[PDB]
Structure formats: C-alpha cells, structure tokens
Amino acid sequence: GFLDGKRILLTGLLSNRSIAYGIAKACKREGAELAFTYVGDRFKDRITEFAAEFGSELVFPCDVADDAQIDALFASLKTHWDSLDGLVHSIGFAPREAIAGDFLDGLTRENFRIAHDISAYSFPALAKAALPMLSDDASLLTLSYLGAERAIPNYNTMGLAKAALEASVRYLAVSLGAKGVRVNAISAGPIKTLAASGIKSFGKILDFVESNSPLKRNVTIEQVGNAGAFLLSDLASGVTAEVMHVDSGFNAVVGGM
Amino acid sequence: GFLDGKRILLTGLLSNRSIAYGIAKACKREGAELAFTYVGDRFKDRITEFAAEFGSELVFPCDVADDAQIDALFASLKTHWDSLDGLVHSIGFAPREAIAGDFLDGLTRENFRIAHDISAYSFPALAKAALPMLSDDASLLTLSYLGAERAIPNYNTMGLAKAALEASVRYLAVSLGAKGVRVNAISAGPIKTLAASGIKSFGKILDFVESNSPLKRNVTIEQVGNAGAFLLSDLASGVTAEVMHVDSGFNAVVGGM
Amino acid sequence: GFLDGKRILLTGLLSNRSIAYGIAKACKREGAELAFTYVGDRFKDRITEFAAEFGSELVFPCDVADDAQIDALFASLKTHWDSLDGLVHSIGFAPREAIAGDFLDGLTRENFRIAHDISAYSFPALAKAALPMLSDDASLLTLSYLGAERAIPNYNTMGLAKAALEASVRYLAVSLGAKGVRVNAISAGPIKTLAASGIKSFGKILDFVESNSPLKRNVTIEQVGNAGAFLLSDLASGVTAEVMHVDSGFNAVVGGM
Amino acid sequence: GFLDGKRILLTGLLSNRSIAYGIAKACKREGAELAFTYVGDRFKDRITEFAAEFGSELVFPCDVADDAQIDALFASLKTHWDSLDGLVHSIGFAPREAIAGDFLDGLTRENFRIAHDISAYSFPALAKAALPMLSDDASLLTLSYLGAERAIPNYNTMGLAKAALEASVRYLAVSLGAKGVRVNAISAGPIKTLAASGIKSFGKILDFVESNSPLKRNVTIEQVGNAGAFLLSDLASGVTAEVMHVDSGFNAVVGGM
Ligand SMILES: NC(=O)c1ccc[n+]([C@@H]2O[C@H](COP(=O)([O-])OP(=O)(O)OC[C@H]3O[C@@H](n4cnc5c(N)ncnc54)[C@H](O)[C@@H]3O)[C@@H](O)[C@H]2O)c1
Numbered sequence A, B, C, D: 001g002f003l004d005g006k007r008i009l010l011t012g013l014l015s016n017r018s019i020a021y022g023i024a025k026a027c028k029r030e031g032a033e034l035a036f037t038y039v040g041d042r043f044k045d046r047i048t049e050f051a052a053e054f055g056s057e058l059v060f061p062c063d064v065a066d067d068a069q070i071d072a073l074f075a076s077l078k079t080h081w082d083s084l085d086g087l088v089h090s091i092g093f094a095p096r097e098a099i100a101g102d103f104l105d106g107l108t109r110e111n112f113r114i115a116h117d118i119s120a121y122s123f124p125a126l127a128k129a130a131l132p133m134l135s136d137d138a139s140l141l142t143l144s145y146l147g148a149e150r151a152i153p154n155y156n157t158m159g160l161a162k163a164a165l166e167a168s169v170r171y172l173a174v175s176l177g178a179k180g181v182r183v184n185a186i187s188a189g190p191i192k193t194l195a196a197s198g199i200k201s202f203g204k205i206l207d208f209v210e211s212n213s214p215l216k217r218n219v220t221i222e223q224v225g226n227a228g229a230f231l232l233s234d235l236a237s238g239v240t241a242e243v244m245h246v247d248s249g250f251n252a253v254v255g256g257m
C-alpha cells in the first residue's frame, strides 16, 4: 500500500465507532505499523485488543492533561521505534454543560480551560514531545469540526478550542516545516461516536447534513480514514498546514432553504 | 454625533498609544458617555487622568484573570449606569517567550493557559457578566490580528488565542443576538503600542505592511477608533459576528513579490 | 455629517426599494452631493425625479454593456464635477433561467457571459473609466452576496459572477491603493428589491435568514445604506479590499439545526 | 492501484511539464484507463505520442471555446467508453497583457470575456456535456491558484476568473452531488510550465514560495498528480466541493518578514 514501512502512532481510539479506529483501519490496509494510546487503566484491555486487531502489541498510556504522561509516552515509544513517521491527534473533551444549551450558560473559566487544554493545546504538545524522534518527512494529523469556522448549535465552547486547534496546525507546520514535516487537519462531518453523545442535538445535525450536503449523505469513519491515511502518506508530500473537509461537501453550502 | 446617548465601557486603555484610546477619542467625539477599566492598583491614578481627559469619573478595577473582579466591575458600574450600550474588549497578554522565536520553543502548558485565559476567555466572560444590564441594541467589540487567520512570525501562541477569540465572536453573536445585541471584532493592522514591544521584530512587520499593503501605508488608532465607533453605533445595526479588517487592506494580498 | 463636501456617483437606483436608494439617503443625510445613473431612455424621467429628491440635477445614462456610455458617463460628469469622491456599483444582471432551478440546467455560454459582463466586469470597468477624475482619497463601493462564498439554491450562475466581483475588489484595491483610493464591497443579506424577484423562492431565503440569523431579523436598505456611507467616508480610511457582511450575521452560522 | 478499472478523461496535457501530465502519470500508476484531449491540429501528433506513453489510443480534439467541439468530444468518447469515471479540467487562458503589469492597464471587456470563458466557464460546461455518461460515483477535478483568494502581483484578471471557477466547483458539487458525483479543485503552488511563462515575474514568485512556504520548497507535478489521483479515486468519496491547497503550505502564512 501507499504507507508501506511507515510507523504511525494513533491516539483517541476508544471504540469501533471512533474516528481513530477508521483511520487505523485504513493505515493498516496501506501498509503501516501502528501503535496506540489510551487514557485510564480499565481501557488497557480493550485497546490492547484493538492493537492486536491491527497486528500491534505497542500500546501506551497517555492522559494529555499530565505533562508527565506525555513525555513518558515518547520515551517508551523510542525503545520500540527508532523513529516516528506519523502521529494522529484524535482527542477531544469538554465538560458536558459547556457543550449543551446556550454558549454562555455553560461558560465558566474552568470549562474553558479544560476544553482548550485537552482539545487544542495537547496537539502541539504531543508534537513538541515527539520532535526528537520524528522522521524527516513525518506527517502529523488532527481532527477538527466545521464548528470552528461557523457557529453551530450546541457546539459552543468546543468551537473556540477547535479554532485554536486549526490555528496551531498552521503554526506547527511552519515550526516543523523546515525539517520537512507536514501538519494537517481533517474537518470531519458528523459521525455517531462516543464523544458525539455529549452534543445535545447531535441527531438534528446528522439529518440536516444528510439532507443538505451536496452528496446527500453523511460521512463514515472509512471515508475519514482514507482521507487521513492519504495525508499521513507521501502521496500528500505537497500538502501541509491544510484543513481538509471530509463532510460530504456540507461546509460549502447554505442548506435548509 | 452618531453615538449620542450611548454609554460605552472601555477596557485596555494603558497609554495614549493604546488602541482603546483611539476608540475612546472617536466615541467621545461622536457623543458617547465613557467608562474605563484598569488592572493593578498603581494604575488607578493614570486611568483617571485619561478618564477625565474624556470627561468621565467612572473608573473600575478589573484583572480579567480573577472571576471576582469581573463580577464586581459590572455591579459597581450598575450603581452609576442603568444600562450598558457598548463594550470594548481591548485586552491581550501572553508570556513573552510564547511570543518570541520559534512557536514550540515558547510552548508550555502554562503559557498556553494564560494567553488563552486573558486574550480569549476574557471576552465572553465580560459579556456574560454584563448581560443583565445590556440594552436591546448594545454592541460588543474586541480586537484581533491577522495572526489568527494565517501564521505570522513570532505571533505564535497568541495566534491560537486570537483564533479562539474570533470564534467567541461568532458564538457570542448567536447567544446575545436574540436579545438584540451585536458582537463584532476588528482585525487591526500593526500599531506600535506597549503590547507591540512584546513581539520581537515588530518593526519588520510595520515595514512590510507599509510596503506591501494596498494603501501602501500603516493604519492608526485614529482609523481603528473610527472603525470601532461605527461598529458600536446604530450605523452598524445590520452587522454582527463580523471580523473587520482595518489594516490598509494587507490581509487581502500576497505581498513581497 | 461625515460625508460633508464629498461628491458621490450612485448607480443602480431604480426604485425606492433599491439598495442604492438606501445608500443615497444615508449619503445625503451625511452631507454628500449626489449624481445618479440610469439605463435606457424610459427610465430617464424616473431617475430625474429621484435625483430631485436628493437635491440633484446630475443624471447620466449608462448601460454598462456599452463601452461608449461608460466613457461618456465620466466625460459628462467632468463638466459638472472637477473630481469624484465616491462611486457606488449597485448593478447586477443575469438571464432568469441562469438564476432559477438547477445550476447546470440554466448554464449556457451566453448566460455565463452576460452575468459576468454586467455583474462583475462593469465594476472595475467603471473604476478604470473614473480614475482620471477620482480624488486622492476617493472610495469605491460594490454590492455582493453570500452566494459567492457558499452554494445557495437558485443563485447558481450569479454566485460565480459575485466571486469574480469580490476578487475584482482585491485587485482593484492594490491597483488604486497607491493613489490613496479604497475599494470595498458589502455582502448584503436578502432584501426584497426588484432584482430579488428574479431569484426563485427568494421568500424562502428571507424566512430562513429571519429564523436562523444571530439577530433573528432581516436587514434593510437603511442598514446597508449607513454601512455603505461609512465605507465611502474618511471614517473608513484604514479599510480597503474588504467584503463586509451586512446580513444580521447570517454568514457566520450553520442554521436549521 | 487505488484507481483500478476507473476510466478517466484528461484535458490540458500539452507537454511533459504540464500539470495534467503529472496527474496522468499518477492515474496510470494506480490502474486507470486514460483518454486525452488536445486543441488545434498541429498538436494531434504530440498528444497521441503522450496517450501512447500511457497505453491509450483515445485522443479527441476539443477547443473549449466552441460549444460544438465540447458536445462532439463526449459523443466520440461514448463510442469507446460507455461510462466516464473521471474528468480532469486542467485548462487556462488569458491574453498576455491581462496577466501582466497593472490590473487595470490590461483590463478590457474582451480580455475579461476570454479569461472567464476559457478558464472558468469551460469547466462546468464540460461537466454538463459529460453528464449523460458520468458514472454514479465519478469525480471531476479542476486546477486553481491562490490568486483567486488573495491579490497576487501580475495574476490580475486571471484571479477573477479563478474565483469564479472555485465557485463553480461548489455549485457543480451540489448539482451533481445527488447523483453521487464529486467535484473538487486543487489550488496548486507555482509550477514552471508553458502557461507559467505568461506570468511576468514567475521566478520571483518561485523564489518567494521556496523561502517562505512552511516546507521551504516548491511543489512538483508529481505531488499535484498524487493529490489529483486521490481526489479522483473512491478514497476521497467523502470529499466534494473542496479546494485543496497543494502549495507546500504557502497559502497559510504571511511570508517575507
Ligand atoms: N464524531 C464526530 O462527529 C466528529 C466530527 C468532527 C470532529 N470530530 C473530532 O474527532 C476527534 C475524535 O472524536 P470521535 O468522534 O472519533 O470520538 P471518541 O469519543 O470515540 O474519541 C474521543 C477521544 O478523546 C480521548 N480523550 C479525551 N480526553 C482525553 C485526555 N485527557 N487525554 C487523552 N485522550 C483523551 C478519548 O480517549 C477518546 O478516545 C475529536 O477531536 C473530535 O473533536 C468528531
């Protein structure tokens, strides 16, 4: 495949519905070697089995809230991999009151801090910690949502963070770019995942996108996965600092009328 | 003038070079009543001199890092003003290492937290605390920079925060729009202010903009001030969720070639 | 007012619902001297009556399809006005089939050509023709629609033209900028005007914007007029190459959910 | 490869430097069957030599200025291929004066017409003529330049056309999307090609992008080609109405400082 011999580290794999699972599925198909992260202990078993499904024994704990676990992630990884060809940042979090109802009702300094700490900052943080072992033509990838560009109901505080996230894509790309490293994001359309359940009217978003997107259909983790594998590969060696929409074209229209 | 009888609260006035001072001059010229904030105690005297310069006795302390000072700002203001017609958010801060040199060099979890806390969160925080006394056609205004939209050298962590800020503009507009309140931003060009001294090689950006911007000239706080007065006034009652470029058109070109 | 002594030529005044009529009124209110254009002979009486309402006798024919009338427009104006301080391009046209139903169904080489000829080329065409008598800090203004940025139902071929138009703003601004001239556009929200009747299901868009826009209301030509007057004035001297949304914030959200 | 059994029609292949050659080059590698177009007779021999290099005998004349040749193109193709899985629009033209020096100096109603006729209209025009034989999951691709988004020196009238083109991408995606067809564009960075020679100071742009783009390097037709092959394949079935930047990240920075 077009990722032969590339070693890629995936975060955010939580279930077989997770976006990170779809990307994983595609990277494996195209010849990648995979390593995974998890947060919390009880999940050690499930992720090790996910890793086993993809022919990997390489699983590491990493709660991006802790500086210690981040540094420790790549110290451990260096003992297995001399270098890293790809990193996928598929992580997001917000206190549910901060992603439900009115934007201001759930706005607190503490909810703001956490959403940005976990959903935005953690990406260049992981980039910084991996830099000592990144290959010369490595590729970093994160996941964003249209909610950064425009105000979407219920997304609220999470839209602020993703705007910061998409900005870090551009700044990371400049910083790591001279070395030949690429940094991009996929702005995925709505997909039913564990995190999605935290969004109050998620079901309303799904039907609307299915109805109004140019392709008249929602996206799948297979579609996001192929797009991700592409950006992680040398096929996209001319592409960096990009926010690519894989949302059946929804971002480019005004639907509902 | 076109702000007659409008009561506007101004933050971020620190010197006669500050952007908030330019807006203040224009608002007063157009007939507004002004109130000002300061941070720290030692600054209590200077802002009063500036406040008197605009025919005002209304000064209140507000370090937007402290939840308490924010709430007290509008409780104290409420004893003087029945309602609030305009709010100007002219606040910015980042640890200087986070706005100097390489993006990752100055990237630390704590630098990220602070820049976003002060430069982004503080805007909707002030909006939420002010909400009880905002008029039907009140107008909130914040200041941004092109560094949120594209990667500009040295702007670094502040670019991430400014991206969140511009996103908060949109979500604020949706939340407060139903009540009739408008929320906008000016993406201002480079102005040599106290804050400007914190961005290393600020001088090259000024030279570059003066040379390559369509109008072949940098902008002034007089110009940004007039632009602010427009947005705070009933002249712009059809304008909300907007990021207005006041940078002699620089954002719209690829200069240097 | 803030247009004292400014001489402004307004095109596209056809009725008291026209956007150009709202702009004229705001410009007159703020102290400008006005001149108007019309297309065809029959309309000569109609515009002359409109010009009198604004204390003007300066009316000139100009069908922008004809190169001759454009050059002749500013030859005639020159005999009355030594210089021109503002020019408003409120012109648009396309065969109705090209702005009805499906995009491809109404696509013909000729429909494409005309839409772009009248709605796009005529703006920089008039700019070029006016330059010999434009003042040092003159201001050019055109009207666009969100249909340039994103695909809107039934707008179709007109969306292509508006994208060219918004591009012409940027290239014009660089071209005319060294002289000190500013060039901007207003992206107006839906307004019930004569041109509006050519957009099938215009009413559906009106209802949708009123329901989903942040301010929960459609805009008026008075709001667009004040915004236009601002951009034409020296209050906006730091503003060029800008496409400013005056649409109650509709552009910044994903409505319907 | 990942384009096995897909039949793709390529336009705009003129030399071994052409962008269309890089795409052809990638599509064949990935298992596609190719057919090509040429314009003028004199080039008939040359393109057949190219088509043979990619194992094809299918070559057809098509000057996209003539409605007749467009219709005839897909009539002839229909005799060899029952269906079409891919269409590549790699076509552009403008009078040399309209892409040289000042924007207004080279502006004529006629130069404008030609640039928009060939570089913009010709794309959805070909899409429409192909529609009767497009596969259900076929994929259309065009080439654009950053000059549509921002004002670039010397690009001038061509930037307007490319802006209309990028809009036609969005409206096409909606029109053809219900059928399952995808429409995208690649906004390519500078490539030294035959068309490139029409832009004064092409080299000045090359030097600047290599110096300021995040990857500190210009792009190649191989890189644009792989990106093109991706979008034409079912790997990007979740991607439509997209303008993908393949320019080493240049669009995302403010360079020169
Ligand atoms: N599913 C969608 O509709 C959708 C759409 C657009 C973007 N996204 C983005 O995709 C990414 C993945 O979300 P998903 O929908 O695939 O869901 P998911 O809920 O299965 O995954 C979210 C992941 O975040 C991880 N995470 C949360 N807090 C963490 C922390 N402190 N440290 C480490 N990991 C932490 C969890 O372990 C989990 O695997 C997120 O960034 C989300 O914003 C999702």
Ligand SMILES: NC(=O)c1ccc[n+]([C@@H]2O[C@H](COP(=O)([O-])OP(=O)(O)OC[C@H]3O[C@@H](n4cnc5c(N)ncnc54)[C@H](O)[C@@H]3O)[C@@H](O)[C@H]2O)c1
Pocket: B011, B012, B013, B014, B015, B017, B018, B019, B020, B038, B039, B062, B063, B064, B065, B089, B090, B091, B092, B093, B118, B143, B144, B145, B187, B188, B189, B190, B191, B192, B193, B194, B195, B196
């Ligand atoms: N100067 C420029 O070129 C420029 C360009 C674009 C945007 N901006 C933005 O304009 C705004 C004002 O900057 P300026 O250039 O006028 O500068 P200035 O340095 O004179 O003012 C900055 C203000 O921030 C305030 N501030 C900092 N930390 C604070 C805190 N914790 N709590 C409360 N207030 C705090 C200071 O009191 C000061 O009044 C900022 O938001 C800045 O991002 C500036």
Ligand SMILES: NC(=O)c1ccc[n+]([C@@H]2O[C@H](COP(=O)([O-])OP(=O)(O)OC[C@H]3O[C@@H](n4cnc5c(N)ncnc54)[C@H](O)[C@@H]3O)[C@@H](O)[C@H]2O)c1
Pocket: C011, C012, C013, C014, C015, C017, C018, C019, C020, C038, C039, C062, C063, C064, C065, C089, C090, C091, C092, C093, C118, C143, C144, C145, C187, C188, C189, C190, C191, C192, C193, C194, C195, C196
């Ligand atoms: N009404 C809206 O909802 C709306 C929204 C966004 C933008 N606009 C823009 O507003 C402008 C028109 O304002 P309006 O829509 O209120 O309409 P209007 O119908 O009153 O004006 C359209 C004008 O175009 C002029 N015109 C048409 N063909 C012409 C030609 N060949 N030569 C010269 N003039 C010609 C007509 O004389 C008329 O005055 C257009 O540029 C249109 O794109 C309108």
Ligand SMILES: NC(=O)c1ccc[n+]([C@@H]2O[C@H](COP(=O)([O-])OP(=O)(O)OC[C@H]3O[C@@H](n4cnc5c(N)ncnc54)[C@H](O)[C@@H]3O)[C@@H](O)[C@H]2O)c1
Pocket: D011, D012, D013, D014, D015, D017, D018, D019, D020, D038, D039, D062, D063, D064, D065, D089, D090, D091, D092, D093, D118, D143, D144, D145, D187, D188, D189, D190, D191, D192, D193, D194, D195, D196
């Ligand atoms: N070269 C670059 O740096 C660059 C960058 C961005 C976008 N582009 C776009 O890429 C496309 C191809 O350009 P290129 O640089 O690969 O160059 P190229 O000059 O080799 O190809 C241009 C093609 O246009 C075709 N063409 C022109 N007029 C035509 C007509 N009337 N009918 C049919 N075909 C016609 C020619 O056959 C030729 O193959 C163009 O659309 C151009 O806008 C080029």
Ligand SMILES: CCc1cc(O)c(Oc2ccccc2F)cc1F
Pocket: A091, A092, A093, A094, A099, A144, A145, A158, A189, A190, A191, A192, A193, A195, A196, A197, A198, A199, A202, A205
């Ligand atoms: C609306 C589509 C969408 C976007 C997400 O970022 C998303 O992921 C999160 C949402 C809120 C908080 C944390 C997330 F990871 C889930 C989702 F369904």
Ligand SMILES: CCc1cc(O)c(Oc2ccccc2F)cc1F
Pocket: B091, B092, B093, B094, B099, B144, B145, B158, B189, B190, B191, B192, B193, B195, B196, B197, B198, B199, B202, B205
């Ligand atoms: C355009 C250059 C520029 C941008 C700013 O946002 C700016 O304002 C700040 C930047 C960093 C930290 C605090 C600021 F107020 C100052 C300045 F000179």
Ligand SMILES: CCc1cc(O)c(Oc2ccccc2F)cc1F
Pocket: C091, C092, C093, C094, C099, C144, C145, C158, C189, C190, C191, C193, C195, C196, C197, C198, C199, C202, C205
């Ligand atoms: C949908 C909102 C809208 C936008 C226009 O550009 C508009 O103006 C025109 C539309 C089609 C043809 C000519 C026009 F001036 C009218 C209108 F109602």
Ligand SMILES: CCc1cc(O)c(Oc2ccccc2F)cc1F
Pocket: D091, D092, D093, D094, D099, D144, D145, D158, D189, D190, D191, D193, D195, D196, D197, D198, D199, D202, D205
């Ligand atoms: C500056 C990058 C660039 C863009 C083009 O569209 C391009 O192709 C053309 C340029 C002008 C006129 C017709 C073209 F096809 C060549 C080129 F070098």
